[PDB]
Amino acid sequence: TFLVKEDSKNVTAYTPFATPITDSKSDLVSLAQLDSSYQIADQTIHNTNLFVLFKSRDVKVKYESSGSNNISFDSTSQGEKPSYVVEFTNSTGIKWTMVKKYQLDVPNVSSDMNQVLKNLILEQPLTKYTLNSSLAKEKGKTQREVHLGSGQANQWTSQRNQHDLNNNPSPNASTGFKLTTGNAYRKLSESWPIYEPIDGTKQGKGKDSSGWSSTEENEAKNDAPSVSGGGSSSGTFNKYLNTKQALESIGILFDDQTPRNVITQLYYASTSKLAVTNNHIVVMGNSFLPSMWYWVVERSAQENASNKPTWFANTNLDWGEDKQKQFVENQLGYKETTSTNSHNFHSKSFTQPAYLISGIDSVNDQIIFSGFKAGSVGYDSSSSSSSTKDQALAWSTTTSLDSKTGYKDLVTNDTGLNGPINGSFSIQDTFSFVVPYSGNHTNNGTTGPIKTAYPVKKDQKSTVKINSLINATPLNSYGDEGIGVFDALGLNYNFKSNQERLPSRTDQIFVYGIVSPNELRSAKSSADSTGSDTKVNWSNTQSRYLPVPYNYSEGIIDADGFKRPENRGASVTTFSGLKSIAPDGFANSIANFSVGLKAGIDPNPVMSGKKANYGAVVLTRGGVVRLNFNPGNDSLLSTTDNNIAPISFSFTPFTAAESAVDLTTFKEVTYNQESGLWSYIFDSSLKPSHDGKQTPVTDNMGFSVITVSRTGIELNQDQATTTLDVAPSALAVQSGIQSTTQTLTGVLPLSEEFSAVIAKDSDQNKIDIYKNNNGLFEIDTQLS
Amino acid sequence: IDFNRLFTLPVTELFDPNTMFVYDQYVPLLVNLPSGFDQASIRLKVISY
């Protein structure tokens, strides 16, 4: 029998003939002995029992910079509503009964963790209506401006050795972006605004929470007032966008019209996805805002025990090569700390602190995760003065043109390892934004080896305060310059005979991997640790630079080495200049989004003695990614040649039908064990009621379903396929099931060559039976 | 009906091949009987499969 979520609290069971079972509508929130503020976030079936994640709309968390217990539930405001995972079983029709109930306690904070957190600043979440120009930040100080100063232009070549920038050909390389204007950055105790700048180069206030509250918020309120009832909001909307409705639709909690603080938002969002194994229960965040932690719960945990999450900052992932990890870590913040109070993630010896988790699932006792790496860099808070004051320290790490071909050599290329190097370079009849040379190479011949350094002057070394920040997008450098646009769209290619796309190792980094029960036991140990932070090691993980489709932006029609003169123009060079033509329900065309990771076991038989194949699919902007694993080893699929990109990842582009589907409306991802097919369900009801200009949405009704299928030669099929050299891929296809009027309840995969859709077109339910032609659907009017 | 139980297995062992009558244990899963009923009084013959 099939289960159907009627609303945020009830679950109804349906027979294989698409008929509901009478007296089966169960209120699981009540059954789980939880109050009205709770709603089911995620559900999964393990063993034969139902596992359900619950989260309250009334949760309030606090961050206190002093003490030992720094993160805690705001008991004083009746917001001591932690999330819960409950196991439910059948004692019969269908009669549900609670087995085990697990609470999700707040994270434990060490003294070393609290030194970073104290000054940790976070960018307001990316919304459906956030434009390229909102994300756009004012370009920062140049490499020579920081190290040498003004009126020091003539001495780059002379003075550069003393600043450890020996043989650096980029004096004009940007050191970061200003936090004076643009998208709001707030501490764990501060709250984000419902207003988003139309132009983040000139409108917002950035990290200046004080300057916003005292003067700018009032100008924002006067420019962008919210709708009240019907109509289209009579506001000017010239400088700002009101995105309160879009905020609420991605899970932002409010006290009237004021959003709750960052820690509360972070918490509620961290308790969004569920995975179950024989010994553990794993909970991870959503795709809308970054996750700093994750829960590993031993299923044998006592009924009144507190389950603490593990921080991402302790979770050491395998980024592919040792170099690929350093690029991420060296940009997290500055080391040495000749100050004291110069505390960031890198200086207090942590790893990457946040991820934009696309999903979590389990196959053969193994947990599979994926998602984009959230942009985390250091920033200056000096307060008199230093040259880098009120500025984030970020740079492009894209591989140089002269680099050796082959995936391993491209990604291990030392370009932008310790500091900035990329700018704008004229090459023959064209140009590039990537540095043409690395190592000893120059156009004249060869000289000394090229050095890069962290944008902090050795003279201002002591009096500087380099703290930590986390962005809402997979982007690290928001600085308004060409290299950023090329880094985000993947328009950086070499000029050599065999063309390859030069990767970035900090911007648009897709992370994925497979976790064993013991790797989960280490993460539990890390969470329960007393004194210092205990580090976790995840070994079967990889990374990949996955940028947004260039064609989602107006003016770009190809990705090649040769760039047209019009492409050097500020209108298709900067973020504030670039125009979006993206159909996937996102006003931006620069930040990447991932969602609905789902693993599944391949039905097609395998060579005798070989274990059954399994993989996973996740949806990204502009296409489908497939994750390849070897079942004999329960590790990521690998190949012998290092010149080929890890065969554990393949990406297939979408067509206008799949690109047309609004990814922000993802409802449920399902997998048919017999078919070997994935059904991606989109509920158009998940659309926000009003746009950025407070205009009511007229397309927030209906649904759409996408089918994902396995393509290519699969492992262990015959004696030839015992090893592979090409990544087996996937295919995203708009199924044929869709509506613009009906409000979806659920889709029963009735049986192999049939499916049933349950919906409401007034209030009354209607069962639509569609004929399944191995992934492609068509309605049967004869089957009512 | 309960497909997920003993209807998962083939049609083969759902009835006696010689007499062609459905086995006496499967009968309550296909018939709606009243309270305190003698199941010996009724029998289900297989006409096609």
UniProtKB/Swiss-Prot annotation, chain A:
Keywords: Cell adhesion, Cell membrane, Membrane, Signal, Transmembrane, Transmembrane helix
Membrane topology, as annotated: Single-pass membrane protein
Residue ranges, annotated region (Disordered): 134-179, 196-233
Annotated localization: Cell membrane
Keyword Protein biosynthesis attributed: no
Compositional bias (Basic and acidic residues): 136-147
Keyword Transmembrane (UniProt): yes
Phenotypic effect of disruption: Probably essential, it was not disrupted in a global transposon mutagenesis study.
Chief location of this protein within or outside the cell: membrane
Ranges of biased composition (kind: Polar residues): 151-179
GO cellular component terms, semicolon-separated: plasma membrane
Any Gene Ontology biological process: cell adhesion
Name the UniProt record assigns to this protein: Mgp-operon protein 3
Portion held of the full protein: 27 to 817 of 1053
Curated annotation (Swiss-Prot), chain B:
UniProt subcellular location: Cell membrane
Superkingdom assignment: Bacteria
Family: Belongs to the adhesin P1 family.
The gene coding this protein: mgpA
Organism: Mycoplasma genitalium (strain ATCC 33530 / DSM 19775 / NCTC 10195 / G37)
Function: The protein is the major adhesin mediating the attachment of this mycoplasma to the ciliated epithelium.
Residues of the full protein shown: 1259 to 1307 of 1444
Name under which the protein is recorded: Adhesin P1
